[PDB]
Amino acid sequence: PQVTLWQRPLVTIKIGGQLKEALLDTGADNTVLEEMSLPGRWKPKMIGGIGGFIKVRQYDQILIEICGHKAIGTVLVGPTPVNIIGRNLLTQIGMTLNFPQVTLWQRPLVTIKIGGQLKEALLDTGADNTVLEEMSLPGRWKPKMIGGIGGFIKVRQYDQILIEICGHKAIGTVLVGPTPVNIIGRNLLTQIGATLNF
Numbered sequence: 001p002q003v004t005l006w007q008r009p010l011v012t013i014k015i016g017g018q019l020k021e022a023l024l025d026t027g028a029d030n031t032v033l034e035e036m037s038l039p040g041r042w043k044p045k046m047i048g049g050i051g052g053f054i055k056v057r058q059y060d061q062i063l064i065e066i067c068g069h070k071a072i073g074t075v076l077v078g079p080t081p082v083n084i085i086g087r088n089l090l091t092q093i094g095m096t097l098n099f100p101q102v103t104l105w106q107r108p109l110v111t112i113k114i115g116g117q118l119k120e121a122l123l124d125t126g127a128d129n130t131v132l133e134e135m136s137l138p139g140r141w142k143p144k145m146i147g148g149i150g151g152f153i154k155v156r157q158y159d160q161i162l163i164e165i166c167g168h169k170a171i172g173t174v175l176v177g178p179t180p181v182n183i184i185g186r187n188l189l190t191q192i193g194a195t196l197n198f
């Protein structure tokens, strides 16, 4: 299957005998599922996202079927609003990002040029929006709040901003605020023809 990014890239998963929907998330290092019944031992862990941290239960060597593809890996369970399939499992199902083809054994980082400045950013199929660290941008902005796995942050919203993503030009909305990682979300991924392939 090839997947464009005009909509959230959702898949059906089977785990612990149960069926769920989950987000294919190139921006996530880990796989994090809403609270659910799994069998066996687990270790406590803390994981960060936009908004802060959540406590999760870590289950190792869990079998999961992702759209009919089997993988064994670590699954985290806790207070996430969305089930997310992260790179630890995406690699096991041959997932690639294409716009250059990009495997997911490492974070899919790209160089961007925005506001006359060069930065590195994460290609993030799990993000609806594009969120950049604090930086100087010109023009009017609007206040907004956006949510992530740890809660919410306040950002400045800039509309109709020109960004160059690995040489490919897009114009769209960019949010600026206290994110720890520059994130290219689906609003801009679609403009550079990014697709998920597995």
Ligand SMILES: CC(C)(C)NC(=O)[C@@H]1C[C@@H]2CCCC[C@@H]2CN1C[C@@H](O)[C@H](Cc1ccccc1)NC(=O)[C@H](CC(N)=O)NC(=O)c1ccc2ccccc2n1
Pocket (backbone or CB within 6 Å): 025, 026, 027, 028, 029, 030, 031, 032, 047, 048, 049, 050, 080, 081, 082, 084, 086, 124, 125, 126, 127, 128, 129, 130, 131, 146, 147, 148, 149, 180, 181, 183, 185
């Ligand atoms: C960026 C924004 C527009 C706000 N969108 C989102 O945040 C949506 C929100 C959704 C609902 C809540 C549950 C997660 C999904 C997926 N996310 C996108 C999703 O891609 C998100 C993007 C991201 C990457 C890095 C740092 C922060 C945020 N990744 C994550 O939340 C995963 C969670 C995990 N595997 O532990 N975070 C990381 O993989 C990760 C990597 C490095 C880090 C360094 C320092 C601090 C935190 C770090 N977190």
